[PDB]
Structure 1
């Protein structure tokens, strides 16, 4: 199964926002380019990078870092405020072929095809709060159920999602894999689980779910515990076997 280290960027820096609040941002003193280099040396082939400056403020402040990281764009899935085809094209020219999109797909589901047409592999970021779809723009009441939303989006060619349990991001709570497994099986989409991938037990449950779903649960995204060194590179590597 995949085990995907995640890095958030804010104001040029490796960062973490507590409950996603910008006034509560922890900055790390590790160089993001050095960090990514090390991960590739360690044998990681997929790294999750989110531009929070662009996501939260439409700020282009992390573009110099993204350009430096683009050398390794092949091993990166990039997200954060990719809200236009032009933006996605900009990133793609740097070499970022795998892009995480959210509100764009919810406002304009034909963007999935438009992205594929510029050689971008679009990955939908589904976010849930207590099993329910968390999205503040227009959404049919029937689609508050993640399976009902993903069913519709598949008709637009959706193939792969990140499923993030938002209330568990940044915590050491345990991702609800029963919820993820149901989404993966019923919606019939490839899924990377995020939020509360925070212990060796999470990785054990993930590997077990990866097996039960026949690879539909592709793997997990590790943020907090990776950046904090709670789940070491060594441990993550062992579970990607």
Structure 2
């Protein structure tokens, strides 16, 4: 299956905001380009990159790094404030075909079709907690059943998502793959599992669910555990294949 290393970029540097809080931001002493280059060399074919400068500060400070990383764009799925077709087109020109989107799709689902018109694969970031859809701007919404939401978006062309159980990294618990499996099978969508991916058991389990779902669960995304060295590249590679 796929084992996708993930890194956040903020002001040109590899970063991480603890439990999604900007007031608690940390920077890793690792060059973003050398890091991605090493991952490509170690055999990883897909890397998850999030431009926090664009997402949080509406800043283009990370563009130069993303342009230097365009050399590996075919192996990168990029996210971070992608809310307009003009910006999606710019990233696609740089080679980023796989783009992570979320809030814009909830506001205007036709955005999905529009992205496909410029040959972008819109990967919807589905955030959940306790099995319920949990998005910053949709906390009062009547429907918060994951499968229900996805079925609605498939009518608009949705085919793949990143399913993140958002509280796992904070509660120091591992991913609950039963939910991911249910979403994959019932909504019939391709899924990359995220959140609580910090142990070999989680990788072992994901590989099993990868099989039980006949491939719908494409693999997992390793973020905090990857950058913190909790999950070594050796172990990650063992399940990459």
- TM-score normalised over the length of structure 1: 0.96
* CA spacing shift, 1:87–1:171, aligned 2, 3 Å: farther
CA contact (8 A) 2:7 2:14 kept: yes
> Is the Cα–Cα contact under 8 Å of residues 44 and 240 in structure 2 kept in the other structure?
no
- Asked if the contact 2:16/2:25 (under 8 Å) is kept, the reply is yes
Q: Is the 8 A contact 1:129 1:167 kept in 2?
A: yes
Note the residue ranges of structure 2 that are not aligned, 5 or more in a row: none
Where 2:207 maps in the other structure, the secondary structure is helix
- Across the aligned residues of Structure 1 and Structure 2, the Cα RMSD in angstroms comes to 1.4
The one-character-per-residue Cα deviations of 1:82-135 (angstroms, maximum 9, x if unpaired) are: 011111011111111110000111111111111011111110000012211112
Report the number of matched residues: 241
Looking at structure 1, the residues matched to 217 and 143 of structure 2 have their Cα atoms a distance apart, in angstroms, of 21
1:172-225 superposed Cα distances (whole Å, 9 cap, x missing partner): 420011111111111110000000001001001101110111111100000011
Judge conservation of contact 2:128–2:165 (CA < 8 Å) in 1: yes
Moved over 6 A (4+): none
- Cα distance in 1 between the residues matched to 2:229 and 2:100: 25
Deviation, structure 1 residue 139: 8.0
Change (3 A) 1:89 1:170: farther
Describe how 1:142-157 pairs up with structure 2 within 5 A: 143-157=143-157
Are the counterparts in 2 of residues 172 and 199 from structure 1 also a CA contact under 8 Å? no
CA distance in 1, matches of 2:226, 2:103: 27
Equivalent pair of 1:110/1:156 in contact (CA under 8 Å): yes
Q: Which moved more, 1:147-156 or 1:63-72?
A: 63-72
Deviations 1:12-32 (A, max 9, x none): 110110111111011100000
Name 1:115's counterpart in structure 2: 115
Q: Contact conserved, 1:78 with 1:100, CA < 8 A, in 2? A: yes
